[model samples]
Target: ELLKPRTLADLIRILHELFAGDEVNVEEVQAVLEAYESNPAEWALYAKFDQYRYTRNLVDQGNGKFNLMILCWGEGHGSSIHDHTDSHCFLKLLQGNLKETLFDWPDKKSNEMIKKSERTLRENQCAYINDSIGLHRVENVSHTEPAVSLHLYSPPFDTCHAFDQRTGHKNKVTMTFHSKFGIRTP
Candidate 1:
């Protein structure tokens, strides 16, 4: 059952309805994300990035319950194995292919992560992770083409910890935005 939205605003409205709650329903969000296709023309404006990955904020529900962002990944770019800071996250691949690897920590205090599963998400595919889940990493699968993904975070977080599997070390990271409310550098 595809949601044939007449405009981007309509699509966002539907997304808001789906995500409205104290707790985010990952399955429901996944269903809607899989069924709906985003218009490139509407999202292309914020798809700007050069060397590293860029994140653009799309919607921030004033209540601090949920927020949406578009992440643009450059070729050969990827994220470190990290947790979501107890936030529920849903990611939809909008363009190109992404390789996602899930990891597990045998000991909580240790930074070691054992590889659990891996999947390649092509355009329109969706995946998610929550507090209960283990650490994970996402990367652009291609060495040439860049990839774009839409992410929805519940109980939005400003800080997260990234793990160094080899060194058993962790670093706190503060998030930044390339754009906000469809405006550049806001």
Candidate 2:
């Protein structure tokens, strides 16, 4: 199904409708992303960036607690196994197929001991991420279509735990903050 919010008021109303009940509402977020299906302009607003590059948009809600972002992903591109540390996130897949696997930290030094939690995220899928069980990564599996997503964060996440996939060794790095596209963060 396709939904198009003609205005910001409509967008907020729709968000409220989708997130009014559950503490973490996935479906509501999906519905919100689905709105982009009919309104390509809405999608375009967030399409002008590269994925994991961290292009920050203005704050939508949650005060200084959150910042919105538009990230674009290419085929075979993915994020490292990591967590938001102390922040919460709202993610919406706008284009192509996104494959995200959530993991649990079984032990302190075993962050890579991730157990397969989920798979095959498609367009318009919305996900909630809180620090409690928020360690995960995202990738684009499709070769034909590029992936794009919108992320909303609380407290405007500044740091995260990035892990080495081969060794599981973790490094603490500040999240990338960018204006247009390119990033200098490692």
Candidate 3:
């Protein structure tokens, strides 16, 4: 099949079309993620990296079907081990190197997370995860360059749990955006 150059705007439209249909086509959604090489200029607005934490900037609202965002990571920045809250989460490393660590869900009684797998994500690499699959923590593993990852969440939720690596105690928190729809929030 022939592929034409696609823009970020085009990708956003396609994402809505893919999720808005009778069924959410998982395969097609991933294929689109793999195919598109996200342009720096297009996402520069949301490429802001925070010194304190990795920045999560919203790119599209997607009308409640799904939401797209960019997580910009400076050196040593990372997320706490977190769950998808029963949503389908897709990630694409837009640029730079990242380390992804996946863990088995903690037991209801003990709340202990077990390491299942870990992988280094290179530029343009795509990955998928869900609550059923496992909780994960992703970070910019490089000290030389910043990293950026694009994420898509279907049936987006407002709250999720962040787990302690040692204690496995989860803290439920509302997710906040560093920027929404390309505008930085005050």
The TM-score of candidate 2 is 0.71
lDDT of each: 0.76, 0.62, 0.86
**lDDT for position 111 in model 1:** 50
Candidate 1 error regions (>4 Å): 1-7, 56-59, 106-111
Ranking of all predicted structures according to lDDT, beginning with the best and ending with the worst: 3, 1, 2
Q: Which is the leading candidate under TM-score?
A: 3
lDDT of 3 at 153: 92
Number of clashing residue pairs in every model?
0, 4, 0
Tens digits of per-residue lDDT for model 1, 1-186: 336455456656767776556665678777776666766787787676658565555645535677778888889888888888988888888788889988774475655567889999889888888758888889886988899888888878888888887754679998778877667784
Give stretches of model 3 more than 4 Å off.
1-5, 109-112
TM-score for all predictions?
0.87, 0.71, 0.93
lDDT of 2 by residue, 10-47 (tens): 66556544444435344545456556442446656545
lDDT of 3 at 108: 69
Identify the runs in model 2 with alpha carbons over 4 angstroms from their true place: 1-38, 49-62, 110-112, 178-186
